[PDB]
Amino acid sequence: SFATRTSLAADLAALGLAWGDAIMVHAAVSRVGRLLDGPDTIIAALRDTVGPGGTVLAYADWEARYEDLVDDAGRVPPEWREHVPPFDPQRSRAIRDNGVLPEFLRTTPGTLRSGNPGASLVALGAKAEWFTADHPLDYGYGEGSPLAKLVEAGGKVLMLGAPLDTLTLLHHAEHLADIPGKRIKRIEVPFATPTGTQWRMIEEFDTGDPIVAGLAEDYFAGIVTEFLASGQGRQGLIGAAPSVLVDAAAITAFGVTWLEKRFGT
């Protein structure tokens, strides 16, 4: 049978999602079961559960398919530059590699989208403007980023059936961790401007593979599983989906400690 916006809100409240929360969601929509409005049922239920003073967020990123073309310095070959679609935070699609919910949130009326393309978040609700403002273009998973703001605001992250290694916030722990050997990525990015396309080199720690050597690609999942084993966070069903709800500040500190124990001096 169908789960509804009402039934999902009951499940979310039971799992610990609280009135006024800033909630970042990662979802595997099919695992939730039958939904009367599909992915939009999830968005509506989240909004119902945090209420008007809460904020609903997701990781947008952008497709940036031209990245396959760049040279070893990260630059776009001259013959391709004119063809590459520039980033526009109001128009560029969210990436769909981990389901359609971020794109569906992006196109829900009222949603705002932050300005660092590959690190961009979407936000809908009371603090959406603040969460998406002034996203630094370099090291966009670090200080002053939407992820840093989620920690500062005491926000939460919900894995709604999503694979645990897709918890984007742990890239903020990677950025913060005092460990050596961090992998740095440099890539040229085109930005839409009223005066035309402006290209800029972006530098950040790589988030496409673990920040340091010796880790499997899915190592974030193990960090989350250890966090839960330590007695932190909450687990329960949302619809039919096994789900995990964690405090943003708590999981970030745990991930920093996890990395510093294994790679620090």
Binding footprint of its own copies on the chain (CB under 8 A): 2, 4-6, 34-38, 40-41, 63, 65-66, 69, 83-85, 91, 93, 104, 107, 109
CB of 263 to Cl ion, least distance (A): 25
CB of 36 to its own copies, least distance (A): 6
Q: Is 241 annotated as a binding residue?
A: no
Q: Is 30 annotated as a binding residue?
A: yes
DSSP H/E element including 250: helix 248-263
Q: Residue for token digits 């890239």?
A: 171
Q: Is 234 annotated as a binding residue?
A: no
Q: Is 262 annotated as a binding residue?
A: no
Q: Which is nearer to its own copies, 93 or 186 (CB)?
A: 93
Q: Is 83 annotated as a binding residue?
A: no
Non-local (6+) Cβ contacts of 255 within 8 A are 170, 173, 174, 177, 220, 223
Q: What angle do CA 40, 41, 42 make, to 5 degrees?
A: 90
Half-sphere CA count of 73, side-chain side, radius 13 A = 5
Q: Is 26 annotated as a binding residue?
A: yes
CB of 107 to its own copies, least distance (A): 5
**Residue 227 contact among its own copies, Cl ion, none, beta carbon within 5 to 8 Å by kind:** none
**Residue 98 contact among Cl ion, its own copies, none, beta carbon within 5 to 8 Å by kind:** Cl ion
**Residue 29 contact among its own copies, Cl ion, none, beta carbon within 5 to 8 Å by kind:** Cl ion
Q: Residue for token digits 């409005």?
A: 37
Half-sphere CA count of 228, side-chain side, radius 13 A = 14
DSSP H/E element including 238: strand 234-238
CB of 73 to Cl ion, least distance (A): 28
59 binds Cl ion (CB under 5 A): yes
Q: Which is nearer to Cl ion, 20 or 163 (CB)?
A: 163
Interface segment toward Cl ion; rule CB under 5 A; list 28-36, 124-132, 141-149, 215-223: 28-36
Distance CA 12, CA 71 (A): 46
* Secondary structure (H, E, C), 172-213: HHHHHCCCCCCCEEEEEEEECCCCCCEEEEEEEECCCCCCCC
Distance CA 263, CA 109 (A): 44
**Residue 66 contact among its own copies, Cl ion, none, beta carbon within 5 to 8 Å by kind:** its own copies
Give the residue, chosen from 41, 49, 55, 98, that forms a contact with Cl ion under the rule CB under 5 A.
98
Phi, psi of 125 (to 5 degrees): 135, -155
CB of 265 to its own copies, least distance (A): 45
Annotated binding site for CoA, which residues?
A: 26-27, 29-30, 96, 100
Annotated binding site, which residues?
A: 26-27, 29-30, 96, 100
